[PDB]
Amino acid sequence: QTSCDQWATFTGNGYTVSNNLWGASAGSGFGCVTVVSLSGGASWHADWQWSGGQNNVKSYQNSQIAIPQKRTVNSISSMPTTASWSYSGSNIRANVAYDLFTAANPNHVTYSGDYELMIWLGKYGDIGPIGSSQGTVNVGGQSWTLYYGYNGAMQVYSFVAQTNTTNYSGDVKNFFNYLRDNKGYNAAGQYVLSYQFGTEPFTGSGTLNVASWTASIN
Ligand SMILES: *[C@@H]1O[C@H](CO)[C@@H](O)[C@H](O)[C@H]1NC(C)=O
């Protein structure tokens, strides 16, 4: 189904698609999500138009999976995911990105974390991640520009693809392992609180078509 309501959510089979227009107060416009299928992953599209607040994210329309029991990053053996998407519209300033929070407390509120891991498969316009570039890194055989900085007390690592990656197959465990093995990230003590995929728009008119998104934690 389709909804443009600010906080619309749709759930099925452990997947949830949310409108999540948390930054609407930064501009004029709208955001709508359409669920096509929640069987065999999430197939959905995000539609939006935004003006004003040049450097303010307006929303993070996203699909995510339920995480009934929080586990440490090291205890998890695999976090496989696939994504097939395309972006259309005009004057698109927006990204396409995975978002995950972790925290030392497994009972941490799930709307923030000690750390935020982002994996930007797409980047439209002159926008950029939190922090500064730490250079090019290899994860899963693909090159990423890794950014690191703080959003308040929370530390944010964003792996940004060097080309829009519209068909992706990977394992988020490889990204956490990169941090654990190269940036002192405490995978032994951090629990995965969320596992999301969507788009952060700033301005323009856009449609993100997510033909398929799958993710699980094993
Ligand atoms: C994604 O595509 C847009 C539109 O062609 C382009 O401007 C942008 O540089 C691309 N981003 C990446 C990461 O290649």
Task: Collapse the DSSP code of 87 into the 3-class scheme (helix H, G, I; strand E, B; otherwise coil) and give the result.
Answer: strand
Report in angstroms the alpha-carbon separations of 129 from 94, 118, 188, 189: 11, 9, 26, 25
Method: X-ray
b/e map of 80-93 (b: 16 or more CB within 10 Å)?
ebebbbebebeebb
- The set of residues, in sequence order, having a beta carbon less than 8 Å from that of 87 and lying 6+ positions away, is 94, 96, 122, 124, 164, 199, 206, 207, 208, 209
The rounded Å distance from CA 164 to ligand 1 centre is 6
Q: Which of 59, 124, 142 is nearest to 85 (CA)?
A: 124
The C-alpha atoms of residue 171 and residue 48 are separated, in whole angstroms, by 29
The C-alpha atoms of residue 201 and residue 124 are separated, in whole angstroms, by 9
Q: Which of 71, 93, 73 is nearest to 26 (CA)?
A: 93
Q: Which ligand 1 atom minimizes the distance to the CA of 163? A: 14
Max CA pair span of the chain: 44
The C-alpha atoms of residue 66 and residue 153 are separated, in whole angstroms, by 26
Q: Is 138 a catalytic residue?
A: no
As a residue count, the chain comes to 218
CB 155 within 8 A of CB 116: yes
Domains detected in the chain:
2-218 (2.60.120.180)
The rounded Å distance from CA 190 to ligand 1 centre is 33
